[PDB]
Design a protein around this ligand. Sequence first.
Ligand SMILES: CN(CCOc1ccc(C[C@@H]2SC(=O)NC2=O)cc1)c1ccccn1
Lengths: 12, 272
Amino acid sequence: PSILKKILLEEP
Amino acid sequence: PESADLRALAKHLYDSYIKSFPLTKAKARAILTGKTTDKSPFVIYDMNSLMMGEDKIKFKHITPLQEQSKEVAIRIFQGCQFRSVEAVQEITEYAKSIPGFVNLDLNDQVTLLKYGVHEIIYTMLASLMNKDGVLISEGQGFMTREFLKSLRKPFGDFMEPKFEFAVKFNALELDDSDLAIFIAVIILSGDRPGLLNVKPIEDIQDNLLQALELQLKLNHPESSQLFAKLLQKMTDLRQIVTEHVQLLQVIKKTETDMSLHPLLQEIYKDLY
Ligand SMILES: CN(CCOc1ccc(C[C@@H]2SC(=O)NC2=O)cc1)c1ccccn1
């Protein structure tokens, strides 16, 4: 549910 | 000494900032004044020009037109929303470039962004503003302060506090190299609500603060208490995000026709 968490986890 | 390391940190942050944010303050100031020699943003000063230059691009950005049936005020407000959505992602990319950030507990990373993104958005919004208006769509447009203020209640004044902040903030004349560190300091705030491990965050911020101080001393030699003044702006940005959260409540009291983007819903949730 946390979109921020997903964006934080993606390979830069 | 460690001063050299502080300059290396400042440079690293600047380079990451350049990589993360398409429209720099340097490029924005050129447009707002003169040197574009290629730009010439479309000016939106009233309802007629708004229609005329509703970004004009046939529409290549994601999410086509049909946003219609909704009045001007709502469309502009939603446009600001999607801008923020884009900005949150640029800022997240930037935060992940700050030494030590990705090693923090993931939940604290979420919390730092949750409470830090709007403060950064309004800081960078100032880079695109002058006393008469603000640049939109990476400088392809320019909306006047007067126009935004003419919007029907309660939309006619969501931008006013930002312009007021911007005028005073821009008077400090910070450049992109200064802003890169300033923004990093804001993100690494150990006093955000709900943080699990405050110490590691403060350690990183203390270093960023030393780097900011040295940057200001070298880059603004004759600016008395710039560092002190800047820290104060930190607290002011805090007030804007809360002042905005309010207007956002008065808005959901009349228009059940608004709907907030999922990412903004998440960020605003139990914010303030
Ligand atoms: C007037 N402009 C300049 C952008 O100005 C901004 C003003 C406020 C924000 C914060 C958003 S607004 C909200 O309610 N929640 C948010 O996160 C972000 C940007 C427009 C207008 C239409 C389309 C694009 N640009």
